Amino acid sequence: NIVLTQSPASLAVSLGQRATISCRASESVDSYGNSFLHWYQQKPGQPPKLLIYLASNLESGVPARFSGSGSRTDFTLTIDPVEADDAATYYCQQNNEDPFTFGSGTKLEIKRADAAPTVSIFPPSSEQLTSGGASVVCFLNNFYPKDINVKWKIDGSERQNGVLNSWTDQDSKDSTYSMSSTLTLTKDEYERHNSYTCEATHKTSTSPIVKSFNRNEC
Amino acid sequence: VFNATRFASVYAWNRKRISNCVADYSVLYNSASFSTFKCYGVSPTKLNDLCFTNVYADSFVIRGDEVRQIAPGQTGKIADYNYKLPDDFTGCVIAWNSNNLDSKVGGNYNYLYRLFRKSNLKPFERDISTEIYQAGSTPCNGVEGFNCYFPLQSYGFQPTNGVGYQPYRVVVLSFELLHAPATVCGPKKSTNLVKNKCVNFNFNGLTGTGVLTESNKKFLPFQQFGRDIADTTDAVRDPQTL
Amino acid sequence: QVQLKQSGPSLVQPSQSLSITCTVSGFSLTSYGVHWVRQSPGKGLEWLGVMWRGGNTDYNAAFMSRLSITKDNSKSQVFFKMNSLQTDDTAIYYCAKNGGAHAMDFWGQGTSVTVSSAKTTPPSVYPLAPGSAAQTNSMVTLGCLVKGYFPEPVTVTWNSGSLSSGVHTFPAVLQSDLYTLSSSVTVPSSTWPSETVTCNVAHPASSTKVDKKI
């Protein structure tokens, strides 16, 4: 078994800079004149692709910004320059010894400007309450970075049991993040209180975001 | 070769043996149809004033960024295991873009290139062998796998990629001179024939100085110039007009 | 020019057997070797095995005694025979084109394979509509929450593909025998209740079509 120790786990490299992703291997070496590995780039919403094979040649389908070198044990991936389409995970694959597994995964994030998320929350309509359930979703889109503590706070008492957050990584087209916080509750819990407050804590907005609605808005 | 249908790979090139003709090399540099026209050692304007025994046109297609590796004294996988150039390469390497001619919709992956070999190839030596050699200590003995690298790899020729991955038709002109007589030379640029004037003359067979005027002499059809009793050029035949 | 799509597995029971068929087209199958991987089985990218060029088979350490690869050169399809399926084999499988020095150059589309003891579940479609007096902060969103569907996938559209500018597709959240799909579309302020918008939700895994208006 070949343990491909990939370091680090995450990076914050802005546009125009050079990213450094390491990869350590042990067996084997000395194939025909070199002992390098392969590099890949896997997006969270797209299947991966080959960047550069054996760290000394070129591969079609990807631009020529991906390069690198390394020793017989340590390997270095060079992403220079970092564009707006490099916000994805990276892996290195062993090719000289079975198993031909991948690394742990370096999640490269594009260091952009910080921004506050949107202030929106949508209550369910009157036709959705006829089925018995209620879907209250607080919208928090177009923000940076991904460090955000979302907490549903009903005015009666706090409810963190039927909540679920959909944490999405940095998209290829949109450079900002987008997360959807959901709340599963019945019709009797929806008609309990009049107003319901969506609380969110962000790195940029130190003040807690307060946004309420009315149950009669149907 | 410039208007050919489709070239071959970088290791199985169609070597067109050029012989028994003439070719103007200075008109190809100013033709404004080549993307890269750079010779090594010998100027293309001096190629018309020099003869060679055999001329070989090695036609192959490489990518955009690989045009710097086809040069004497350079490294690379295609420069060592596919097309080896000698240290005394006095030929010429030309190239032009063929992205709208050789590429296919979605990617042309028919062109192959050799990654590794058992030994280095000789200069101007074509090798079409597909022997598979193992990378590690455990050989596969036939079917590849379990650390057995395939020696060939498909070229990626997409119509919408960058300029470094477009197909570029490269024709390397090989020149050599041996004890055999030369067959390929350059065309001599002709001028207007002026008669009844004390000027020089330079025909295909012999040159000199004297006034050329019409007379009643008749030469044999396999002769170009003549001599008198004193072994002196006294009469010459024009090569164009009989 | 490289077609490596997958079809056939929809919903598998545990301790069963099913072969994944990846149709190879556009290039010669007898000159390359189809690889097999998984897409995010809890951890990152994991490698399973590699089919040779018409020869033997190689596998991983944790995937040799249960998995098998069968290459059919006549039908131009590579089969991935699975034995003793459990809940840990819930991932998206992929086929890859072999390179020169044992590289994985080109990739395919694959399919979603979900193995669980629970049965299929129809989706609970609930559109996310703004209120009559709801406000915003320089941006109006629009979406329909598809929570409680099983198995993957679910295609969510708005008025048969009318909204296409600011559509943001959320990934499926892996829960206990359930999945959750969110959505967010940047819309102008005249979208509700002025414009008649209907979010269509289609579940091709369970053949259930539940469409609810905004």
XYZ file of C-alpha atoms in Angstrom:
674
model
C 0.000 0.000 0.000
C 1.289 3.434 -1.038
C 0.208 6.283 1.251
C 0.242 9.493 -0.809
C 0.506 12.234 1.817
C -0.889 15.357 0.131
C -0.287 18.658 1.932
C -1.842 21.083 2.652
C -5.577 20.435 2.948
C -6.619 23.906 1.758
C -5.108 27.035 0.232
C -6.085 30.692 -0.220
C -4.306 31.964 -3.348
C -5.495 35.146 -5.051
C -5.470 35.996 -8.748
C -2.113 36.348 -10.481
C -0.155 34.477 -7.794
C 1.440 31.017 -7.695
C -0.023 28.102 -5.730
C 2.152 25.371 -4.201
C 0.650 21.910 -3.635
C 2.914 19.164 -2.300
C 2.699 15.399 -2.797
C 4.903 12.772 -1.135
C 5.481 9.265 -2.501
C 7.757 6.359 -1.587
C 7.437 3.534 -4.140
C 8.352 3.249 -6.850
C 11.011 5.265 -8.699
C 13.171 5.049 -11.859
C 10.648 4.107 -14.534
C 12.646 4.877 -17.662
C 14.329 8.217 -16.966
C 12.131 9.842 -14.335
C 10.025 9.099 -11.266
C 7.209 11.644 -11.421
C 3.462 11.309 -10.858
C 0.294 12.651 -12.475
C -1.730 15.704 -11.459
C -5.501 16.151 -11.559
C -8.090 18.819 -10.780
C -11.548 17.841 -9.517
C -14.351 20.393 -9.298
C -17.229 19.879 -6.822
C -19.749 20.038 -9.687
C -17.736 18.541 -12.547
C -15.790 15.295 -13.132
C -11.988 15.726 -12.932
C -9.415 16.023 -15.718
C -5.720 15.422 -16.342
C -3.536 18.521 -15.992
C 0.041 17.370 -16.687
C 1.561 13.881 -16.890
C 5.082 13.086 -15.565
C 5.650 16.788 -14.582
C 7.601 17.530 -17.791
C 5.102 17.530 -20.688
C 1.854 19.146 -21.858
C -1.713 17.856 -22.042
C -4.574 19.086 -24.213
C -7.886 20.228 -22.770
C -6.200 22.306 -20.045
C -4.247 25.571 -20.369
C -0.470 25.704 -20.028
C -0.556 27.440 -16.620
C -0.185 24.068 -14.855
C 3.413 22.900 -14.437
C 5.769 21.718 -11.722
C 8.710 19.556 -10.738
C 9.991 17.607 -7.754
C 12.409 15.044 -6.395
C 12.052 11.253 -6.287
C 9.915 11.501 -3.123
C 8.426 15.012 -2.965
C 6.482 16.579 -5.835
C 5.319 20.146 -6.439
C 2.430 21.421 -8.566
C 2.789 24.945 -9.977
C -0.389 26.869 -10.830
C 0.852 30.146 -12.312
C -1.120 32.296 -12.820
C -4.251 31.419 -10.832
C -7.314 32.370 -12.883
C -11.025 32.443 -12.020
C -11.474 28.748 -12.944
C -8.960 27.107 -10.572
C -11.241 26.972 -7.496
C -11.252 23.185 -7.250
C -9.621 20.279 -5.448
C -6.339 18.743 -6.597
C -4.997 15.199 -6.374
C -1.835 13.282 -7.242
C -1.886 9.674 -8.449
C 0.832 7.064 -8.011
C 1.819 5.364 -11.272
C 4.895 3.252 -10.402
C 3.376 0.894 -7.810
C 0.033 -0.797 -7.058
C -2.336 0.511 -5.647
C -2.589 3.483 -8.028
C -4.618 5.542 -5.566
C -4.970 9.310 -5.234
C -4.018 11.788 -2.520
C -6.058 13.403 0.225
C -7.088 16.514 -1.711
C -5.945 20.142 -1.603
C -8.985 22.432 -1.846
C -7.674 25.528 -3.633
C -9.799 28.607 -2.914
C -9.483 31.883 -4.822
C -8.678 34.686 -2.365
C -11.181 37.330 -3.460
C -12.699 40.360 -1.770
C -15.034 39.738 1.154
C -18.726 40.522 0.752
C -21.917 40.354 2.791
C -24.583 37.752 1.937
C -28.054 38.602 0.696
C -30.962 39.309 3.050
C -33.896 37.140 1.961
C -36.095 34.388 3.403
C -39.122 32.808 1.704
C -42.121 31.486 3.665
C -44.316 28.789 2.100
C -47.556 29.755 0.400
C -51.101 28.800 1.364
C -51.162 25.917 -1.126
C -48.056 24.359 0.436
C -49.649 24.392 3.902
C -52.544 22.230 2.664
C -50.253 19.180 2.529
C -49.437 19.581 6.247
C -45.779 20.611 6.077
C -43.982 23.938 5.873
C -40.698 24.808 4.140
C -39.026 27.997 5.405
C -35.676 28.609 3.693
C -33.444 31.595 4.484
C -31.427 32.681 1.442
C -27.764 33.647 1.963
C -26.003 34.019 -1.395
C -23.056 35.932 -2.911
C -20.749 36.023 0.111
C -17.080 35.399 0.903
C -15.524 33.515 2.619
C -17.327 30.275 3.506
C -16.941 30.902 7.264
C -20.548 31.599 8.274
C -22.554 30.376 11.283
C -26.234 30.070 10.337
C -28.697 29.479 13.176
C -32.494 29.441 13.011
C -33.944 31.380 15.967
C -37.690 31.180 16.543
C -38.911 33.905 18.912
C -40.464 31.320 21.234
C -37.536 28.913 21.599
C -34.511 27.857 19.581
C -34.996 24.962 17.153
C -31.933 23.244 15.661
C -33.421 19.755 15.210
C -35.073 19.845 11.781
C -32.519 22.144 10.148
C -30.175 21.330 7.270
C -27.587 23.467 5.475
C -26.393 22.940 1.892
C -22.786 24.166 1.921
C -21.577 24.662 -1.659
C -17.944 25.361 -2.537
C -16.679 28.074 -4.877
C -18.356 27.749 -8.269
C -16.500 27.872 -11.579
C -18.602 30.737 -12.948
C -19.548 32.589 -9.745
C -16.513 33.458 -7.618
C -18.641 33.888 -4.475
C -20.257 31.265 -2.253
C -23.924 30.313 -1.977
C -25.489 28.341 0.875
C -29.140 27.440 1.492
C -30.361 26.915 5.060
C -33.544 24.849 5.335
C -36.089 24.340 8.112
C -38.508 21.402 8.280
C -41.625 22.126 10.335
C -45.319 21.276 10.343
C -48.377 23.476 9.874
C -49.023 23.747 13.622
C -45.470 24.972 14.223
C -45.871 27.478 11.381
C -49.084 28.883 12.888
C -47.602 29.034 16.404
C -45.873 32.429 16.228
C -46.488 35.385 13.935
C -42.879 36.315 13.113
C -39.829 34.109 12.586
C -36.275 35.455 12.612
C -33.413 34.156 10.465
C -30.120 34.769 12.281
C -26.753 34.580 10.531
C -23.200 35.371 11.643
C -20.591 36.198 9.003
C -16.915 37.140 9.055
C -17.533 40.436 7.244
C -20.801 41.333 9.012
C -19.955 41.140 12.710
C -23.494 42.234 13.572
C -26.073 39.406 13.469
C -28.286 39.562 10.384
C -31.933 40.010 11.402
C -34.703 39.353 8.876
C -38.275 38.408 9.787
C -41.515 37.759 7.914
C -45.231 37.335 8.579
C -47.304 34.154 8.488
C -50.189 35.987 6.775
C -48.040 36.678 3.674
C -49.710 34.095 1.449
C 3.888 18.646 -49.418
C 2.618 22.095 -48.390
C -0.723 21.290 -50.069
C -0.826 17.625 -49.030
C -3.907 15.784 -47.797
C -2.825 14.637 -44.326
C 0.554 14.109 -42.685
C 1.628 11.129 -40.589
C 2.848 10.868 -36.993
C 6.115 12.204 -35.582
C 7.752 8.746 -35.578
C 6.259 7.196 -38.753
C 6.682 10.167 -41.089
C 6.389 9.862 -44.871
C 9.944 10.690 -45.960
C 9.564 12.104 -49.480
C 12.839 11.539 -51.336
C 13.446 14.645 -53.461
C 15.736 14.162 -56.460
C 16.250 15.110 -60.132
C 14.658 18.570 -59.943
C 15.301 22.185 -58.947
C 13.658 24.218 -56.200
C 13.730 27.915 -55.308
C 14.231 28.195 -51.547
C 14.252 32.009 -51.426
C 10.708 32.214 -52.814
C 9.408 30.081 -49.929
C 10.678 32.516 -47.284
C 8.829 35.466 -48.856
C 5.715 33.458 -49.778
C 3.835 34.786 -46.681
C 2.223 31.375 -46.103
C 4.420 29.842 -43.366
C 3.962 30.551 -39.665
C 7.589 29.661 -38.844
C 10.471 29.808 -41.340
C 13.851 29.451 -39.613
C 16.819 27.480 -40.944
C 19.875 26.297 -39.008
C 23.400 26.956 -40.256
C 22.641 27.550 -43.942
C 20.620 30.514 -45.184
C 17.668 29.726 -47.493
C 18.938 32.332 -49.964
C 22.233 30.419 -50.148
C 20.424 27.138 -50.879
C 19.736 28.218 -54.471
C 23.483 28.652 -55.092
C 24.326 25.205 -53.663
C 23.645 21.666 -54.878
C 22.890 18.614 -52.746
C 22.819 14.879 -53.388
C 19.615 13.779 -51.632
C 16.872 15.916 -50.080
C 14.460 14.365 -47.570
C 11.225 16.065 -46.480
C 10.143 14.602 -43.131
C 6.502 15.663 -42.747
C 4.883 15.420 -39.316
C 2.405 17.288 -37.112
C 3.283 18.567 -33.630
C 1.625 20.958 -31.190
C 2.102 24.699 -30.845
C 4.648 24.769 -28.019
C 6.708 21.877 -29.444
C 8.122 23.912 -32.350
C 11.081 24.999 -30.202
C 12.106 21.374 -29.562
C 12.609 20.560 -33.277
C 16.113 22.034 -33.375
C 19.676 20.680 -33.154
C 20.970 20.775 -29.602
C 17.608 20.661 -27.807
C 15.949 18.223 -25.412
C 12.472 16.715 -25.302
C 10.621 13.427 -25.636
C 9.919 13.949 -29.345
C 13.507 15.118 -29.911
C 15.126 11.963 -28.474
C 12.766 9.000 -28.960
C 10.809 10.217 -32.018
C 12.951 12.517 -34.202
C 16.654 12.712 -33.344
C 18.533 15.691 -34.774
C 22.319 15.583 -35.270
C 24.795 18.074 -33.858
C 25.822 19.139 -37.393
C 22.281 19.673 -38.714
C 22.628 22.143 -41.602
C 19.053 21.774 -42.888
C 15.935 23.859 -42.393
C 12.808 23.432 -40.267
C 9.614 25.131 -41.459
C 6.116 25.153 -39.984
C 2.644 26.530 -40.641
C -0.717 26.421 -38.892
C -3.137 23.647 -39.886
C -5.885 23.961 -37.275
C -8.655 24.298 -39.884
C -7.329 21.417 -42.027
C -6.158 18.480 -39.887
C -8.259 18.847 -36.727
C -11.630 17.171 -36.207
C -14.829 18.055 -34.369
C -14.238 17.240 -30.708
C -10.533 16.444 -31.041
C -8.267 14.612 -33.495
C -6.617 11.798 -31.522
C -5.165 9.792 -34.425
C -1.633 11.228 -34.225
C 0.725 9.325 -31.922
C 4.109 10.063 -30.366
C 6.613 7.796 -28.635
C 7.302 8.490 -24.962
C 10.219 6.130 -24.302
C 12.407 3.515 -25.960
C 15.076 0.970 -25.055
C 17.824 3.113 -26.613
C 18.214 6.470 -28.328
C 17.591 6.635 -32.063
C 20.115 7.604 -34.719
C 19.755 10.954 -36.523
C 17.461 10.698 -39.580
C 16.295 7.213 -38.558
C 12.620 6.246 -38.728
C 11.404 3.664 -36.197
C 7.899 2.203 -36.475
C 8.423 -0.524 -33.861
C 5.848 -0.862 -31.071
C 7.823 -2.902 -28.527
C 6.536 -2.482 -24.963
C 9.130 -2.241 -22.183
C 8.293 -2.322 -18.484
C 8.956 0.561 -16.098
C 9.580 -1.319 -12.842
C 11.156 -4.665 -12.030
C 8.043 -6.727 -12.842
C 7.531 -7.118 -16.615
C 4.075 -7.530 -18.098
C 5.223 -9.594 -21.149
C 2.696 -8.393 -23.690
C -0.515 -6.826 -22.395
C 0.288 -3.626 -20.499
C -0.634 -3.020 -16.876
C 0.854 -3.400 -13.361
C 3.535 -0.712 -13.885
C 3.888 -1.305 -17.642
C 3.767 2.034 -19.455
C 2.494 2.198 -23.022
C 5.211 3.709 -25.264
C 2.792 5.707 -27.442
C 0.258 8.404 -26.594
C -2.473 10.138 -28.579
C -2.059 13.760 -29.618
C -4.736 16.211 -28.552
C -5.757 18.355 -31.533
C -8.933 20.278 -30.629
C -10.304 23.157 -32.748
C -11.084 25.335 -29.695
C -7.946 24.904 -27.566
C -5.072 27.306 -27.011
C -2.386 28.194 -29.528
C 0.043 25.789 -27.847
C -2.060 22.712 -28.672
C -3.153 23.428 -32.256
C -1.886 21.081 -34.991
C 1.133 22.517 -36.803
C 2.437 20.867 -39.972
C 6.243 20.740 -39.704
C 8.415 19.663 -42.646
C 12.101 19.204 -41.793
C 14.334 19.565 -44.861
C 17.313 17.200 -44.704
C 20.406 17.975 -46.789
C 23.506 15.863 -47.395
C 26.470 15.684 -49.778
C 28.339 12.474 -50.602
C 30.689 11.083 -53.259
C 27.690 10.581 -55.562
C 26.922 13.440 -57.980
C 24.304 15.945 -56.890
C 20.718 15.810 -58.154
C 18.968 18.731 -56.414
C 20.174 22.254 -57.191
C 18.730 25.760 -57.350
C 17.264 27.564 -60.357
C 19.529 30.158 -61.941
C 17.695 33.475 -62.293
C 17.662 34.454 -65.973
C 17.848 37.988 -67.361
C 17.270 39.631 -70.733
C 19.581 38.755 -73.624
C 21.278 41.831 -75.113
C 23.091 41.473 -78.442
C 25.541 43.728 -80.330
C 27.046 45.179 -77.152
C 30.380 44.774 -75.348
C 28.930 43.115 -72.237
C 29.453 39.905 -70.293
C 27.463 36.692 -70.646
C 26.762 33.829 -68.241
C 25.020 30.771 -69.673
C 24.237 27.449 -68.004
C 27.391 25.823 -69.380
C 30.093 28.487 -69.575
C 30.568 32.220 -69.044
C 32.977 34.806 -70.396
C 33.227 38.217 -72.034
C 32.455 39.139 -75.624
C 29.946 40.552 -78.073
C 27.238 38.030 -78.972
C 25.794 38.371 -82.477
C 23.969 36.134 -84.934
C 25.879 34.077 -87.496
C 25.463 31.055 -89.779
C 26.893 28.406 -87.439
C 24.816 25.370 -86.459
C 25.522 23.505 -83.222
C 24.707 19.947 -82.247
C 21.608 19.656 -80.005
C 23.620 18.149 -77.106
C 26.165 21.007 -77.014
C 25.949 24.384 -75.273
C 29.256 26.135 -76.039
C 32.126 25.833 -78.487
C 35.861 26.409 -78.880
C 38.143 27.463 -81.726
C 41.540 26.096 -82.801
C 43.196 28.082 -79.972
C 40.887 26.539 -77.360
C 39.020 29.798 -76.760
C 35.279 30.382 -76.386
C 34.460 31.782 -79.824
C 30.778 30.797 -80.118
C 28.002 29.948 -77.653
C 24.401 28.748 -77.871
C 21.653 30.471 -75.908
C 19.964 28.018 -73.502
C 16.439 29.440 -73.828
C 16.279 30.421 -77.511
C 17.715 27.874 -79.963
C -14.915 11.888 -29.491
C -14.675 10.287 -26.033
C -17.966 8.749 -24.868
C -17.796 7.006 -21.479
C -21.349 7.330 -20.170
C -23.019 4.858 -17.814
C -26.569 3.545 -17.469
C -28.418 0.598 -15.975
C -28.157 0.816 -12.161
C -31.059 2.720 -10.591
C -31.568 1.382 -7.049
C -29.742 -1.632 -5.611
C -30.449 -3.607 -2.440
C -27.609 -4.523 -0.055
C -25.947 -7.961 -0.270
C -26.803 -8.170 -3.978
C -24.943 -8.183 -7.294
C -25.154 -5.799 -10.247
C -22.797 -5.017 -13.134
C -22.188 -1.406 -14.162
C -22.037 -1.015 -17.952
C -19.938 1.871 -19.305
C -20.476 2.189 -23.059
C -17.216 3.031 -24.849
C -17.618 4.821 -28.178
C -15.725 7.242 -30.390
C -12.339 5.523 -30.081
C -10.794 2.055 -30.127
C -11.436 0.137 -26.909
C -8.792 -2.467 -27.818
C -5.991 0.142 -27.655
C -6.721 1.647 -24.216
C -7.629 0.523 -20.711
C -10.755 1.716 -18.916
C -10.197 2.732 -15.289
C -12.753 2.867 -12.480
C -13.059 5.364 -9.610
C -15.696 6.788 -7.261
C -16.871 10.363 -6.695
C -16.737 11.411 -3.026
C -17.595 8.336 -0.886
C -17.342 10.399 2.282
C -13.683 11.203 1.649
C -12.148 12.663 -1.517
C -11.237 10.949 -4.779
C -10.811 7.190 -4.369
C -9.389 4.722 -6.890
C -10.807 1.228 -7.424
C -9.013 -0.620 -10.215
C -7.693 -0.646 -13.763
C -8.615 -2.892 -16.691
C -5.695 -3.914 -18.898
C -5.567 -3.808 -22.707
C -7.349 -7.123 -23.111
C -5.528 -8.972 -20.339
C -5.556 -9.358 -16.559
C -7.039 -7.067 -13.893
C -5.613 -4.981 -11.057
C -7.530 -3.716 -8.032
C -7.067 -1.750 -4.824
C -6.425 -3.270 -1.399
C -9.948 -2.612 -0.077
C -11.663 -3.333 -3.415
C -10.157 -6.612 -4.681
C -12.183 -9.309 -2.901
C -15.585 -7.785 -3.762
C -15.222 -6.016 -7.130
C -14.470 -7.367 -10.600
C -13.931 -5.826 -14.039
C -15.030 -7.556 -17.253
C -13.981 -6.080 -20.605
C -16.092 -6.963 -23.662
C -14.329 -6.088 -26.919
C -17.208 -7.200 -29.168
C -19.927 -4.906 -27.778
C -17.398 -2.077 -27.074
C -18.524 -1.979 -23.436
C -16.600 -2.468 -20.186
C -18.548 -4.126 -17.368
C -17.882 -3.518 -13.661
C -19.230 -6.549 -11.803
C -20.001 -5.758 -8.154
C -20.383 -8.429 -5.470
C -21.476 -8.109 -1.812
C -22.771 -4.543 -2.020
C -23.127 -2.604 1.242
C -24.034 0.946 2.243
C -20.418 2.124 1.845
C -20.568 1.694 -1.961
C -22.859 4.722 -2.450
C -20.900 6.939 -4.856
C -20.868 8.106 -8.471
C -18.750 5.778 -10.605
C -16.644 6.971 -13.535
C -14.787 5.440 -16.472
C -11.513 6.915 -17.723
C -9.424 6.746 -20.886
C -5.885 5.428 -20.517
C -2.904 7.612 -21.359
C 0.690 6.891 -22.263
C 2.474 6.452 -18.927
C -0.563 4.928 -17.160
C -2.386 8.273 -17.069
C -6.116 9.033 -16.953
C -6.514 11.676 -19.654
C -10.213 11.738 -20.574
C -13.238 11.125 -18.372
C -16.911 10.263 -18.713
C -20.300 11.183 -17.298
C -21.107 8.076 -15.243
C -24.236 7.400 -13.226
C -25.372 7.579 -9.605
C -25.331 4.221 -7.795
C -27.119 4.163 -4.430
C -27.202 0.997 -2.307
C -29.427 1.122 0.775
C -31.856 -1.129 2.624
C -34.680 1.421 2.423
C -37.033 1.640 -0.548
C -37.530 4.520 -2.964
C -39.136 7.753 -1.782
C -41.086 10.289 -3.882
C -39.891 13.898 -3.595
C -41.677 16.448 -1.418
C -41.768 19.482 -3.704
C -42.135 22.819 -1.898
C -41.447 26.000 -3.904
C -39.876 28.985 -2.144
C -42.055 32.012 -2.926
C -41.763 35.536 -1.479
C -44.518 37.083 0.582
C -46.886 39.912 -0.240
C -44.925 42.340 1.970
C -41.505 40.662 1.903
C -38.509 42.914 1.277
C -35.028 42.315 -0.129
C -31.515 43.786 -0.228
C -30.685 44.670 -3.881
C -31.302 41.070 -5.074
C -34.421 38.893 -5.420
C -33.928 35.121 -5.432
C -36.127 32.220 -6.539
C -35.987 28.486 -5.888
C -37.831 25.279 -5.100
C -36.644 22.981 -2.314
C -36.603 19.277 -3.188
C -36.127 17.518 0.156
C -36.821 13.866 0.869
C -36.170 12.247 -2.521
C -34.541 8.850 -3.015
C -32.469 8.018 -4.983
C -30.419 10.471 -7.052
C -30.918 12.425 -9.350
C -33.620 15.105 -9.654
C -33.779 17.666 -12.472
C -35.217 21.029 -11.397
C -36.284 23.606 -13.979
C -38.426 26.745 -14.136
C -41.076 27.099 -16.890
C -39.357 24.429 -19.055
C -36.013 26.224 -19.042
C -37.002 29.899 -19.091
C -34.702 31.063 -16.283
C -31.070 30.418 -17.240
C -29.054 33.530 -16.275
C -28.492 33.239 -12.526
C -29.324 29.593 -11.860
C -27.261 28.130 -9.009
C -27.415 24.351 -8.558
C -26.857 23.091 -5.005
C -25.311 19.651 -4.424
C -27.287 16.745 -3.012
C -26.887 16.457 0.762
C -26.202 12.873 1.862
C -28.539 11.969 4.737
C -29.912 8.794 6.313
C -31.501 7.109 3.242
C -32.605 10.539 1.967
C -31.349 13.407 -0.177
C -31.940 17.164 -0.267
C -31.661 19.408 -3.339
C -31.742 23.201 -3.044
C -31.911 25.880 -5.725
C -31.433 29.631 -6.103
C -32.178 31.697 -9.222
C -31.538 35.446 -9.417
C -34.808 37.002 -10.611
C -36.051 40.588 -10.992
C -38.602 42.080 -8.620
C -41.467 41.664 -11.129
C -41.340 37.847 -10.943
C -43.989 37.393 -8.224
C -46.937 37.747 -8.127
C -46.798 39.427 -11.545
C -45.167 36.691 -13.632
C -46.755 33.236 -13.676
C -43.833 30.984 -12.711
C -44.116 27.216 -12.262
C -41.177 25.170 -10.976
C -41.161 21.723 -12.602
C -39.509 18.924 -10.608
C -38.832 15.597 -12.339
C -37.537 12.462 -10.614
C -36.298 9.999 -13.273
C -35.049 7.462 -10.707
C -38.528 6.763 -9.301
C -40.503 7.952 -12.399
C -42.404 10.480 -10.267
C -43.374 13.900 -11.647
C -44.539 16.359 -8.970
C -44.860 19.918 -10.293
C -45.934 22.760 -8.003
C -46.475 26.403 -8.923
C -44.573 29.262 -7.302
